[PDB]
Amino acid sequence: SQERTTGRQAQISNITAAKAVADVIRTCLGPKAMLKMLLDPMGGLVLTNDGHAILREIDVAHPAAKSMLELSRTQDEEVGDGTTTVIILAGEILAQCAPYLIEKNIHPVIIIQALKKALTDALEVIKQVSKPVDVENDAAMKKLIQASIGTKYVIHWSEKMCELALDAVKTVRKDLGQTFEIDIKRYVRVEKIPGGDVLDSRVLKGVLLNKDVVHPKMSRHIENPRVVLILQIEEEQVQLMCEQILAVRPTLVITEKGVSDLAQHYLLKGGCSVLRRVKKSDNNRIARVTVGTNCGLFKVEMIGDEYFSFLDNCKEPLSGLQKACTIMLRGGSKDILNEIDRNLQDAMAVARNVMLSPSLSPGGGATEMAVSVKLAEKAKQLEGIQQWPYQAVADAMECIPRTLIQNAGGDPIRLLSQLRAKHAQGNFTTGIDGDKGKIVDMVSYGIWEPEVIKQQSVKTAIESACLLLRVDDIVSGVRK
Amino acid sequence: GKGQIISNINACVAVQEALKPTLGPLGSDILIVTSNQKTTISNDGATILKLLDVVHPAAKTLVDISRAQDAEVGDGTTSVTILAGELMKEAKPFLEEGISSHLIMKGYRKAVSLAVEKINELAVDITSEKSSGRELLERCARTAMSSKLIHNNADFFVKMCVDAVLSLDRNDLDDKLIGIKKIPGGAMEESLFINGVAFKKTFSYAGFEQQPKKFNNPKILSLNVELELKAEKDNAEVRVEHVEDYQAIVDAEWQLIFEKLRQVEETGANIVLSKLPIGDLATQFFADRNIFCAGRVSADDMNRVIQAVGGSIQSTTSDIKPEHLGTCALFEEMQIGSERYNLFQGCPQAKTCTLLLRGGAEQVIAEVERSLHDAIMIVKRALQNKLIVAGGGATEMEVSKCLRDYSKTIAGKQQMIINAFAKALEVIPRQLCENAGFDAIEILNKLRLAHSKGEKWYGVVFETENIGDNFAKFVWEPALVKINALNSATEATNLILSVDETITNK
């Protein structure tokens, strides 16, 4: 087997690999974006706006387009926030390198030199249009989650849904005192049980143990639930564990399995409520916080499907590190619960990036227009051999908002002509309205995104184009 | 594209190696079997390329130049294809370099332009050597016997063909007038000097022995009129109820043909010639009057009657006058291989001398006609303008080292192309040494030091297996041979490098 391409055939085949896919994802951008349908080998279909599963199910005959999926996974693991307005930028580069590549006989390394210089000037623009805001205010993050959920009707439930995640945000945080607000939200698991209402979700600052107690009618209050990290066999062995913990006199019990009848005699004599088996992952949640002490209160609730247990430390220190908790999501229906999970699960990375860079970059196509003007300004100053390739990079950032205009179906020339003045000269808050397809203030309308969204994307997107310019020959069909 | 150029170059590499036995007297024969069942076998690189069949379209460049080199020199012209083939082979890595094919073509343009200046300087006037009218052409004819298959039988034509070319008028030279008739069969030493028209054999029926084959002083008469009874007569309507009037149809032409043969004989012509075939009715009439007649005069036979004989053609028998009749001193008809040859002799007005080539081999007899024809073209351009250069392939070696002297005056990126053209020029003597079995490196190291000291003309003769001067050995070459060779080969190299793609329809 050969499958080798040399000369002009090598560059043409690799550009058209991701070029045809770039036109397919043009409907994935913006709040007006469409919903793509997929075809698996089993004949089924998956209808979603997330481009992560779109490129995975679609099999491209060219191996050059396979890296774009891997390049998409890097942005999903690092950011993974609002892929509607983010992940589409992976295919907006190679499409704009087509006009001059072979026609001018420019060697790819010469283009690589212009690619390295474009990343230097791009890092200064990201933090230039960013503006700081109060990092301790939770009301600023309430309107931020509402921007990415506009693909569904959950805006009516956004009051409970936004506060559902944000209560866990402020709950964790705190991986360092000073130098940066690192956290880990993977310890907080969101359980989705069909049926009920979203208001059934109980979230607050502390460690939420999702399990039940011995009996549902048992006392719901404990003074200081201190945490500590067939019939005949169960009653003897479990008693050697739960009762042995009582040596330090805790009022809270944590076991792997249930409590038998014999253990109930010596467990209830302590004058408190006894908690039976606790979920396995819940022990790792309290292991971060804390023999643990300083537990304020305990509470237990009753509802048909599963039960609840409330454990409130309320004082971590006496510094300390992050706290972990649990979240249960109760949807209205079966098909409604599974579809809305994409917006709520991504809400963890929404506020996580706010703690990283409190500065805020303008959204709604305003960031791409700001970079396109700065790249066009530095092109005439640098000149040299980079004049042609570095100017085309400015047009690459200009076609990104053109994709947002494609949803409306108008003429981008009319809008982009006005954006070269009111935005560049006027202010960085000027952008394209998603709903009305007009030019309005992004901050006044409520469209904005953290700096980490644009910083970790454009920087990764520019570095992702390196593999596209290094292609020479393709060898396949042997082994590995 | 780029691969199409290399494919066109590699297609000519197999031809270059195939033409190695062609050039040079020490080469070997090549068998070419055509659709006529006649196998072409020759040691000369001209006739081979004439009937050579090719396949790839790019080989037509070597076919087109083969017809041009034939009208100029006629022998030893393979060096035109050897140079054009080697320059393309040496330029294969150069095409991948930064030098475009144009600078390579411009390099060959400046190389041939500076070569003509060297050839003009190397041209030596032979009249300053005190060479008489004999030794001038004689030494030039002996050295012209090379490149030909049979050297032994060529020595028999040395003292003859010189007198045969000098028999032709030196003021007006014509190839068709000096044209030579081929006789199949017989030894090469059996040839003769003929001053007049020759016929294949004859076409006769029944007894041919009643006609005298030798006349004393016959009057040569050539006519294009046909003698036949009721041949071209159109269909007519003849209503005859009588006897004699119906019989007079055939008797009218029988009496008319008797008057035609009588009026021609009254002019005194003992030799009657016709164009279209004739019947046997004139046999009895010619046998009793002792008059010989032969028909089917060919195209080459008519041109000899025009100039050499100086006769005339008159169809009307009553219009034939003695002013339209020729003559001659002696008429002799020689028979070879049971085939009689009518031969006109003793014609002082004839400005040409026809040669009779007798040979046993069909492949050799075809080359000998063109072998003597090449010497005719040599004596032609050399007599008008006298220039002598050393033959044997050492003429380019004097220029080869001299081309390196012009490269020192270039001092640029094109010097690599000039040095390549000078190095690729040395393949001609190496292929001549390959057919001789000599070492390639040992002789080439001697060829470079040859012209390095004495300069002038140093030939390195290959017959004695030693180094020497071909000028002292009386080995000469016409200077116009390499002039048209280097000028025409440059355009052949410029045409190949200029074609980036080949389009073929259907």
Partner: protein, 529 residues
Amino acid sequence: GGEKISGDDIRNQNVLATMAVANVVKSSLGPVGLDKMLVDDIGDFTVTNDGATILSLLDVQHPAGKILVELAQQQDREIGDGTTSVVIIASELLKRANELVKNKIHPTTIITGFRVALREAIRFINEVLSTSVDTLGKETLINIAKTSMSSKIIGADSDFFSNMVVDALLAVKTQNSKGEIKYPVKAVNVLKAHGKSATESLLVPGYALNCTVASQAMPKRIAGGNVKIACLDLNLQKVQINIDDPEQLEQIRKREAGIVLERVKKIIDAGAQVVLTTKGIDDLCLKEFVEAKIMGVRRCKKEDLRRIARATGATLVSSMSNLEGEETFESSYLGLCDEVVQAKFSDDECILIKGTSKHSSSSIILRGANDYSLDEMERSLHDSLSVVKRTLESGNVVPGGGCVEAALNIYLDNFATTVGSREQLAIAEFAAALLIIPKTLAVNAAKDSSELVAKLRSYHAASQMAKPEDVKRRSYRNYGLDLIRGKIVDEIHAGVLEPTISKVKSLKSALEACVAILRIDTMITVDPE
């Protein structure tokens, strides 16, 4: 199982097919070249400039070309680099060797002409050889490092790595072969992480183990100096038997799990400060490590702990045992290090071992964009550290960028006239073949080739042209290339040099390997039954 092929086809069809494959890999020569995509058919691919990786996965149906592929295996053993650059020299050796064998001279005279030329070629290199000495600071080791960073896409980021690789190799500095400086291979541990940039890498003068603690509640840092460390292979994991009372089998597993529980308790009896366990450890046995201030590590690779016993000098033990039948942990298996500090790079802890005893080691933690980037950076620094290894082992270094091939021109031209006979033509072709390497660089540079080649001949001729004993300058020696401005620049000002081993024992071994192809007369192929 097949027919045979003889005649000029073996000297051509086998050589031309090799030239076709050789012309493919020429696009990766030099920093101005490009990299080839190697597809694994599984949906992922690896784009690399390494010649050993490309030629290994490349399908070759001609046995004549398989010998040239095996050159990268023996070259990486003696040299350790050149697959991105030097390996190309074995290509053009057969280019001009084909035109000579197609006319008259038998390949024997041609090869023996190369043998007499290669014998004096080592001395010709020694004449232009510039030893490493009288240089300010690390400029030599920095220039050799930057040369090893050439041909890689991260060569622009080499402004950092150049200073790190020099100090990293000084960390692994040991003494062996009766008082000779040695840099053991694999002693430098290369780690990968996603984040930061290339210039953000950390220089660690010691071993670094990438792993996390067993239990997430265990202490993440152990303070104090002279902390002991040990590597244990102990495994913690869950015949005719007549089952009557379940307490019989329960008593057996109670003793089995009880002894294994004691196996961890016997560790603290010897005073082990740090314990490294190959397999996993239950959360119950981890309690003894917290009270004794021990940092436990589980799920370790056998090759990871083997390098620790070599660098630190501790003795590896499989399980609890001694000279007797009792199962315990002796104190003779404990090592020593300066301090134990846990560095967390992209949610990955690292065990820092400083002040090794048996063998001095170092580590390099690389942080970069993504996988295909770091995956390329692995082979980038793998062959880079071997270049400086041969630099400090033998102080003889030769200029790079086509300087050696340009200088040997006059050396081989004057040597061809000395021998003469029929070997003069072969020597001239061997000199003109080496000039193809800088010509290939101009192909990937999008510039004029012969424009620089005419400068490689002219500017390097002043050496032998003018008398070197009379000085007179007019010769800066090297010159040889520029990869940006397309001008003639000295290598000293450019700072690009390579060890002599990159040429000697490289082309000398390649020339002797390529002449074996010219020796081949016929070819016999037997298809599998």
